[PDB]
């Protein structure tokens, strides 16, 4: 029961079976029989386990993290503020990681769904993919083993300056 609009399931568009010729029923004997043999004998068990779970509920919460001044309001040293800033930077980072995972999976499921149509109906999702992965590519990409904030803020300084010269040559 995952959140739907995060992970699109397009219209199912199932075709209507047409026998079109009178012959035996090779799989359907066994799709019905399977749905007799392996459907209910499991279903009873899953349902029983359901009620067993439901007689005593639990509640577990997705944690939250509040915000902080991050890197800006910290002085050049005196770590006591910095620690918060840069570690939560690391959190938000991993968050972005999993965003990249999500998009990257949407693309895969997209091609698998389309079939032979590979370049038809994945254009939108591949497009936003190049958008996001170009963002990540621009921001976090090349720093190194040891990275905290100072280096991300650093690279952002680098781009802002390179684009400020680029926009003086824009004249």
Region near another protein per CB under 8 A, out of 16-24, 51-59, 115-123, 149-157: 149-157
Q: Tell me how far apart the alpha carbons of residues 94 and 99 are, in angstroms, rounded to a whole number.
A: 9
> Least distance to another protein from the beta carbon of 162, Å?
13
> Least distance to another protein from the beta carbon of 112, Å?
33
Is residue 165 part of the contact set for another protein (CB under 8 A)? no
Is residue 142 part of the contact set for another protein (CB under 8 A)? yes
User: What Cα–Cα distance (Å) separates residue 22 from each residue in 25, 26, 27, 65?
Assistant: 9, 12, 15, 65
Residue owning tokens 């952002």 = 156
Region near another protein per CB under 8 A, out of 10-18, 71-79, 101-109, 115-123: 71-79
The encoded tokens of residue 47 equal: 């349902």
Among 53, 113, 157, 159, binds another protein (CB under 8 A): 157
The encoded tokens of residue 160 equal: 């802002």
Residue (of 153, 154, 10, 169) closest to 71 by Cα position: 153
Is residue 71 part of the contact set for another protein (CB under 8 A)? yes
Is residue 72 part of the contact set for another protein (CB under 8 A)? yes
Give Cα 123 to chain centroid, integer Å. Answer: 18
The residue (of 74 and 110) whose beta carbon lies closer to another protein is 74
> Least distance to another protein from the beta carbon of 65, Å?
21
Q: Tell me how far apart the alpha carbons of residues 108 and 122 are, in angstroms, rounded to a whole number.
A: 9
Residues that bind another protein (CB under 8 A): 71-78, 142-144, 150-151, 153-155, 157-158
């Amino acid at each position: 029961s995952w959140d739907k609009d995060v992970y699109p399931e397009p219209p199912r568009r199932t075709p209507a079976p047409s026998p079109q010729t009178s012959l035996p029923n090779p799989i359907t004997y066994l799709t019905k029989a399977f749905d007799l043999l392996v459907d209910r004998p499991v279903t009873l068990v899953r349902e029983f386990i359901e009620r067993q779970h439901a007689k005593n509920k639990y509640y577990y919460y997705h944690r939250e993290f509040r915000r902080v001044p991050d890197i800006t309001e910290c002085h050049e040293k005196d770590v006591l503020c910095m620690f918060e800033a840069e570690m939560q930077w690391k959190r938000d980072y991993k968050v972005d990681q999993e965003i990249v995972n999500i998009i990257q999976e949407r693309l895969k499921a997209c091609q698998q769904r389309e079939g032979e149509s590979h370049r038809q109906n994945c254009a939108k999702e591949l497009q936003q993919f190049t958008q996001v992965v170009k963002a990540y590519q621009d921001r976090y990409h090349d720093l190194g083993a040891h990275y905290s904030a100072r280096k991300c803020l650093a690279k952002q300084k680098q781009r802002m300056l390179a684009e400020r010269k680029a926009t003086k040559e824009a004249a």
